[PDB]
Subunit: 163 residues, 4 copies
């Protein structure tokens, strides 16, 4: 068979990367519930290093519950802080991943594959240990890196508009 | 003579220009309604959506600021028009976002990612009406440079800043 | 219902298909000349170049196998047509490559690189005439997937194997 | 100023990467003339690691003077062998870089920038220590890697057709 390099993203790679983020959020949450803040922060660090693209420079990350001065988490510390708190530079952050999450459901509205990147827009439903479901409107953008792995370079999460 | 060259890549200046052109268009639809009423605004909004968005390629990933939780994702031209100018029984909750007498748009980028043929921006956009009432949104755009070298919106996620 | 999706990426199967379609086209021009003469071949070559190449975007990076050292690079539609079918005073050394009664094209890829919106192939192509005379070339193609999802040649470098 | 990531290639980046290859060929050639085969092979190894993209998988490399069985140098060893010989697996290779090259001139016919990659097609003129000029027809394709540096993923070199 002809030796090939495929820098392009497939549908199945995008769907996998969406789930992988869900699994990573939950893994952080159950690890906090079970082993405390220090173990979660260390798990969260490896998760961000793995699934995000802060290595390339800024990530276009607007987290769901980020407050109006510190809205855009363009740095690795900004992401970690949003998910597990424990950073005095982000004093409004208690840790979004620390609410005992257990189930994440992806409901895509549309996917756009532009070759090396892919953008998804739809709903994500995050359910805690007691079945308290939070619905968010989520845009992700994935870049396939030089090692063939999908990295979040864009992450816009918003609570559905009510009024 | 200079080497003939095809450039499908987006530059920073093309991205900033396309951001400003969307602002100008929102304001141009808003004044045209204040000045000449619904019909004129609608016809202008239609050319704007045909020009600045990329519904020609298939669905656009458009989550508008003030879109209500059943009709959240405007993946069709009609969805986008309806959001801006209303007047569509299929989007009954849409009075028209562009019809609030908008006069100034300010772009405050936090970050830009140029992935070659496309470019994503994230940051604040501040839209101010004739009375100086400022609406601040958190906005993500993605621009694709079409076969004719013009930047088209294929992704548009706008959200009100989270208030605790 | 299935999530609506835009796919501007090229797949392996799209690349192999586009390779085979170029072969089929060369053979279809060659037989059409053997069977119906110059005029018919020319009109067919024109639709082939308009279909399979990307002169619509600007220059194509086309270095044909048997192109002579003044007129080496066929960056214009006319250059490409002339190479295949001749009949152009502006390319006086061109008898027409496609007019040698070609009947079989075999693609032997050494490697494929899909860079997302484009895909490059390098390897051998073996073009055999009505008498079974095999011409082997070393060939590089680059395909771009246009706004309509069809693969267009923007790069075509063909060379006779180096003989010491 | 807004923090930005630019995975796109500019005209000036392509022109630089074309010259950089010229400089690298010559550097190998003068290093052989002056310090012998071992020093050139070691310089040539770092040159290929740097300017080519064998890290991603196969490179679409058809060298000017490569012979009909071993035409396509899809492996790092194939490239090294073509440029400096000294590999019994490529027995027809004496070393293309070992002919005392001194001047390389790029004459582009056309450049196509497809975002993350750029293809050049034109002439390259390589002149030795005595002014013996070899003209080649050259296609290059450059991919900007995750670290912002241009890497040759395609290299088709042919002697101009004579007859």
């Amino acid at each position: 068979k002809t030796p090939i390099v495929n820098r392009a993203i497939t549908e199945s790679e995008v769907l996998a990367a969406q789930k992988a983020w869900g699994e990573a959020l939950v893994a952080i949450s159950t690890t906090y519930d079970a082993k405390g803040k220090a173990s979660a922060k260390a798990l969260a660090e490896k998760v961000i290093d793995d699934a995000y693209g802060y290595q390339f420079g800024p990530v276009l990350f607007k987290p769901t519950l980020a407050i109006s001065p510190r809205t855009f988490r363009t740095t690795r510390a900004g992401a970690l802080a949003y998910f597990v708190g424990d950073d005095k530079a982000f004093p409004e952050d208690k840790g979004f991943a620390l609410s005992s999450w257990r189930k994440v459901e992806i409901k895509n509205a549309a996917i756009f594959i532009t070759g090396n990147t892919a953008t998804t827009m739809g709903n994500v439903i995050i359910t805690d240990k007691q079945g308290k479901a939070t619905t968010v409107d989520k845009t992700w953008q994935f870049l396939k890196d030089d090692h063939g792995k999908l990295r979040i370079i864009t992450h816009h999460s918003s609570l559905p508009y009510e009024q």
